[PDB]
Amino acid sequence: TLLTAINERQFRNGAHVEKIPMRLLVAASNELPEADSSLEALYDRMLIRLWLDKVQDKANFR
Amino acid sequence: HPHLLAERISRLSSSLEKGLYERSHAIRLCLLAALSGESVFLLGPPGIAKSLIARRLKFAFQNARAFEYLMTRFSTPEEVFGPLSERLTSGYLPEAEIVFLDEIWKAGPAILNTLLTAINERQFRNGAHVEKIPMRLLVAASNELPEADSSLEALYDRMLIRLWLDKVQDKANFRSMLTSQQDENDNPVPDALQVTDEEYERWQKEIGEITLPDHVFELIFMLRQQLDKLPDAPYVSDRRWKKAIRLLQASAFFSGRSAVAPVDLILLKDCLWYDAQSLNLIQQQIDVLMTGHAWQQQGMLTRLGAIVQRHLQLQQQQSDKTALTVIRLGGIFSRRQQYQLPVNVTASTLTLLLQKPLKLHDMEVVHISFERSALEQWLSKGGEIRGKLNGIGFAQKLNLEVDSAQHLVVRDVSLQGSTLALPGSLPGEIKQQLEELESDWRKQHALFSEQQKCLFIPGDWLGRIEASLQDVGAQIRQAQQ
């Protein structure tokens, strides 16, 4: 269901579909998926892949 | 008198089209079902004007009443037919003609039960004694589809016409639709095109008197058995076949005809499907049937083969006159290839005759056909050739080699020679039998060139019927060259 709400911004509702006024789609996790699995169909469609990490600087931590 | 009826109907449907764009197919089907006593179903999203067509067909009559009710999940039968005091049915449905019911897939159980008796018997359980219901047109639109296992499928299986409406797609038709100054509540139908109550009662009796030709029955029985063998084809009940005849007989009645025309089977594309999956299957089987056995398209193909089989029998007897000389070439290959005849032959599945017959594969043969894509491949690279016998069966392997005199010698299990030959560019017996089959194509083409003015037939279907008739005629004129 998450693959049809990105390319066409639609979602089925029993019979027909309807538009979704979605403006921003964000997703976070921790681990990485497998190399041969069905979860790679959603990762290959996202654009920005942010790489966040914990703080390291001491001045910005005070 | 019957010829002037088609002109009055063509002018009546033209006035109803003014005000709605890309909806000509929906108005024509609702007009024919109203004059014959049938129903019609619509489907589409809210906003494509689905309730306006119900209030538009009421102006084509003189004594017609409208009824637009919105069925909800808490609707009661007393608020539809009339509240009892014996039921105050003053202007509702038992005495109305054209009624409209929106969102019919959500009413109560008592509402659907009363609608089943008002269609088969045209009556209502108005207290003790019953009364007839002068219902002329039954239309109902919605949005979603019913379940696969529910009681709502009882009414859906009884309806005949299943219209598939959708939003506009053309850009030029959307510009003039928003700025349209034509009113949708006036009376655009002239007073001279409106039928009276006496003409309606007389037309309902003359529809059932339309004769059923023997050639038309062969298309209905064949389409019924074809859908039963296909597991993916939707099931068609016996009630749908009986109610479809009343629609086809009414189409030829208002078109200047007295019998059932084979072209009227095109309207069956919207009376057999039930969902979006079976929509592409019904239109595919009818397109093949209308271009195969309607005007005897394939019927003359199986009859022409008997003439060709007899024609090839007389040509192989005198094959000693016209031989088959193979010339060389100068392409890009090392082994000595063999070049066939250039512009003299251009067919893909040509046949090759022979002088002395041989017993190949424990059976006799009089002509061997080689594919143009397969004969040129063996003569180029080499290896083994594969060819069928008598134009039937699979491409079996033969012992064909090259002759010293530039010919084609076919070898068998006894090492016997047989030089092949091609038929040259007409006996009296073949010409007498060919003109009888060719005259049948002109008789079937003359019928199509007289009934094509049917307004109820869509225009996109005429582009494929004419292209199918010219393909059969172009093949029968090749053997007579």
PDB file of all heavy atoms in Angstrom, chain B residues 323-336:
ATOM      1  N   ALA B 323       7.630 -25.834 -65.355  1.00  0.00           N
ATOM      2  CA  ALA B 323       8.547 -26.442 -64.399  1.00  0.00           C
ATOM      3  C   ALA B 323       8.936 -25.444 -63.315  1.00  0.00           C
ATOM      4  O   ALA B 323       8.195 -24.496 -63.040  1.00  0.00           O
ATOM      5  CB  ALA B 323       9.792 -26.972 -65.110  1.00  0.00           C
ATOM      6  N   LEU B 324      10.100 -25.651 -62.696  1.00  0.00           N
ATOM      7  CA  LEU B 324      10.578 -24.757 -61.642  1.00  0.00           C
ATOM      8  C   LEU B 324      12.101 -24.717 -61.735  1.00  0.00           C
ATOM      9  O   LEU B 324      12.777 -25.639 -61.269  1.00  0.00           O
ATOM     10  CB  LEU B 324      10.107 -25.223 -60.271  1.00  0.00           C
ATOM     11  CG  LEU B 324      10.259 -24.251 -59.097  1.00  0.00           C
ATOM     12  CD1 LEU B 324       9.104 -24.412 -58.122  1.00  0.00           C
ATOM     13  CD2 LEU B 324      11.586 -24.459 -58.382  1.00  0.00           C
ATOM     14  N   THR B 325      12.626 -23.654 -62.336  1.00  0.00           N
ATOM     15  CA  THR B 325      14.062 -23.470 -62.501  1.00  0.00           C
ATOM     16  C   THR B 325      14.569 -22.520 -61.423  1.00  0.00           C
ATOM     17  O   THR B 325      14.045 -21.410 -61.272  1.00  0.00           O
ATOM     18  CB  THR B 325      14.389 -22.926 -63.892  1.00  0.00           C
ATOM     19  OG1 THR B 325      13.920 -23.843 -64.889  1.00  0.00           O
ATOM     20  CG2 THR B 325      15.891 -22.738 -64.052  1.00  0.00           C
ATOM     21  N   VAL B 326      15.580 -22.955 -60.678  1.00  0.00           N
ATOM     22  CA  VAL B 326      16.159 -22.156 -59.606  1.00  0.00           C
ATOM     23  C   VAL B 326      17.432 -21.494 -60.117  1.00  0.00           C
ATOM     24  O   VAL B 326      18.313 -22.164 -60.669  1.00  0.00           O
ATOM     25  CB  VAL B 326      16.448 -23.022 -58.368  1.00  0.00           C
ATOM     26  CG1 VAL B 326      17.086 -22.184 -57.272  1.00  0.00           C
ATOM     27  CG2 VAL B 326      15.169 -23.677 -57.871  1.00  0.00           C
ATOM     28  N   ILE B 327      17.529 -20.182 -59.934  1.00  0.00           N
ATOM     29  CA  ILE B 327      18.691 -19.423 -60.360  1.00  0.00           C
ATOM     30  C   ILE B 327      19.631 -19.248 -59.176  1.00  0.00           C
ATOM     31  O   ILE B 327      19.258 -19.433 -58.014  1.00  0.00           O
ATOM     32  CB  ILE B 327      18.296 -18.056 -60.963  1.00  0.00           C
ATOM     33  CG1 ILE B 327      17.563 -17.206 -59.924  1.00  0.00           C
ATOM     34  CG2 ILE B 327      17.439 -18.248 -62.204  1.00  0.00           C
ATOM     35  CD1 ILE B 327      17.325 -15.779 -60.363  1.00  0.00           C
ATOM     36  N   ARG B 328      20.874 -18.883 -59.475  1.00  0.00           N
ATOM     37  CA  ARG B 328      21.892 -18.693 -58.455  1.00  0.00           C
ATOM     38  C   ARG B 328      21.790 -17.279 -57.883  1.00  0.00           C
ATOM     39  O   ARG B 328      20.835 -16.544 -58.146  1.00  0.00           O
ATOM     40  CB  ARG B 328      23.277 -18.976 -59.034  1.00  0.00           C
ATOM     41  CG  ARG B 328      23.495 -20.424 -59.443  1.00  0.00           C
ATOM     42  CD  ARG B 328      24.906 -20.645 -59.962  1.00  0.00           C
ATOM     43  NE  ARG B 328      25.096 -22.002 -60.465  1.00  0.00           N
ATOM     44  CZ  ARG B 328      25.479 -23.031 -59.717  1.00  0.00           C
ATOM     45  NH1 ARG B 328      25.712 -22.860 -58.422  1.00  0.00           N
ATOM     46  NH2 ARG B 328      25.627 -24.230 -60.260  1.00  0.00           N
ATOM     47  N   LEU B 329      22.784 -16.884 -57.091  1.00  0.00           N
ATOM     48  CA  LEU B 329      22.808 -15.562 -56.481  1.00  0.00           C
ATOM     49  C   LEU B 329      24.258 -15.160 -56.240  1.00  0.00           C
ATOM     50  O   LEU B 329      25.194 -15.861 -56.635  1.00  0.00           O
ATOM     51  CB  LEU B 329      21.986 -15.538 -55.185  1.00  0.00           C
ATOM     52  CG  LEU B 329      22.287 -16.590 -54.113  1.00  0.00           C
ATOM     53  CD1 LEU B 329      23.367 -16.121 -53.147  1.00  0.00           C
ATOM     54  CD2 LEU B 329      21.018 -16.953 -53.357  1.00  0.00           C
ATOM     55  N   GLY B 330      24.436 -14.018 -55.582  1.00  0.00           N
ATOM     56  CA  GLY B 330      25.760 -13.524 -55.259  1.00  0.00           C
ATOM     57  C   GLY B 330      25.797 -12.768 -53.947  1.00  0.00           C
ATOM     58  O   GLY B 330      26.295 -11.640 -53.884  1.00  0.00           O
ATOM     59  N   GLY B 331      25.270 -13.382 -52.890  1.00  0.00           N
ATOM     60  CA  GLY B 331      25.214 -12.760 -51.581  1.00  0.00           C
ATOM     61  C   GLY B 331      26.511 -12.889 -50.812  1.00  0.00           C
ATOM     62  O   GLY B 331      27.608 -12.892 -51.383  1.00  0.00           O
ATOM     63  N   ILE B 332      26.385 -13.001 -49.491  1.00  0.00           N
ATOM     64  CA  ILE B 332      27.542 -13.095 -48.609  1.00  0.00           C
ATOM     65  C   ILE B 332      27.538 -14.453 -47.918  1.00  0.00           C
ATOM     66  O   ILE B 332      27.080 -14.580 -46.778  1.00  0.00           O
ATOM     67  CB  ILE B 332      27.552 -11.949 -47.580  1.00  0.00           C
ATOM     68  CG1 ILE B 332      27.374 -10.600 -48.282  1.00  0.00           C
ATOM     69  CG2 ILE B 332      28.847 -11.953 -46.783  1.00  0.00           C
ATOM     70  CD1 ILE B 332      28.478 -10.268 -49.260  1.00  0.00           C
ATOM     71  N   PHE B 333      28.044 -15.474 -48.606  1.00  0.00           N
ATOM     72  CA  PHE B 333      28.117 -16.817 -48.045  1.00  0.00           C
ATOM     73  C   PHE B 333      29.054 -17.649 -48.910  1.00  0.00           C
ATOM     74  O   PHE B 333      29.271 -17.347 -50.087  1.00  0.00           O
ATOM     75  CB  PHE B 333      26.736 -17.472 -47.961  1.00  0.00           C
ATOM     76  CG  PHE B 333      26.661 -18.608 -46.981  1.00  0.00           C
ATOM     77  CD1 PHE B 333      26.633 -18.360 -45.619  1.00  0.00           C
ATOM     78  CD2 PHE B 333      26.614 -19.921 -47.418  1.00  0.00           C
ATOM     79  CE1 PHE B 333      26.562 -19.399 -44.710  1.00  0.00           C
ATOM     80  CE2 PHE B 333      26.542 -20.964 -46.514  1.00  0.00           C
ATOM     81  CZ  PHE B 333      26.518 -20.702 -45.160  1.00  0.00           C
ATOM     82  N   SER B 334      29.606 -18.702 -48.308  1.00  0.00           N
ATOM     83  CA  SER B 334      30.564 -19.563 -48.993  1.00  0.00           C
ATOM     84  C   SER B 334      29.879 -20.664 -49.797  1.00  0.00           C
ATOM     85  O   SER B 334      30.155 -20.827 -50.989  1.00  0.00           O
ATOM     86  CB  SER B 334      31.536 -20.178 -47.982  1.00  0.00           C
ATOM     87  OG  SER B 334      32.462 -21.039 -48.622  1.00  0.00           O
ATOM     88  N   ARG B 335      28.992 -21.424 -49.160  1.00  0.00           N
ATOM     89  CA  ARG B 335      28.312 -22.515 -49.844  1.00  0.00           C
ATOM     90  C   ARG B 335      27.365 -21.974 -50.910  1.00  0.00           C
ATOM     91  O   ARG B 335      26.754 -20.913 -50.753  1.00  0.00           O
ATOM     92  CB  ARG B 335      27.543 -23.375 -48.840  1.00  0.00           C
ATOM     93  CG  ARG B 335      27.003 -24.677 -49.410  1.00  0.00           C
ATOM     94  CD  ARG B 335      26.262 -25.477 -48.351  1.00  0.00           C
ATOM     95  NE  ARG B 335      27.147 -25.903 -47.269  1.00  0.00           N
ATOM     96  CZ  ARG B 335      27.894 -27.001 -47.303  1.00  0.00           C
ATOM     97  NH1 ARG B 335      27.866 -27.792 -48.366  1.00  0.00           N
ATOM     98  NH2 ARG B 335      28.669 -27.310 -46.272  1.00  0.00           N
ATOM     99  N   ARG B 336      27.253 -22.719 -52.009  1.00  0.00           N
ATOM    100  CA  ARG B 336      26.411 -22.322 -53.131  1.00  0.00           C
ATOM    101  C   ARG B 336      24.943 -22.278 -52.726  1.00  0.00           C
ATOM    102  O   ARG B 336      24.299 -23.323 -52.584  1.00  0.00           O
ATOM    103  CB  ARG B 336      26.607 -23.279 -54.309  1.00  0.00           C
ATOM    104  CG  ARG B 336      28.005 -23.248 -54.908  1.00  0.00           C
ATOM    105  CD  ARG B 336      28.145 -24.260 -56.034  1.00  0.00           C
ATOM    106  NE  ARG B 336      29.496 -24.280 -56.587  1.00  0.00           N
ATOM    107  CZ  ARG B 336      29.905 -25.124 -57.530  1.00  0.00           C
ATOM    108  NH1 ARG B 336      29.066 -26.021 -58.028  1.00  0.00           N
ATOM    109  NH2 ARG B 336      31.152 -25.069 -57.976  1.00  0.00           N
TER     110      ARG B 336
END
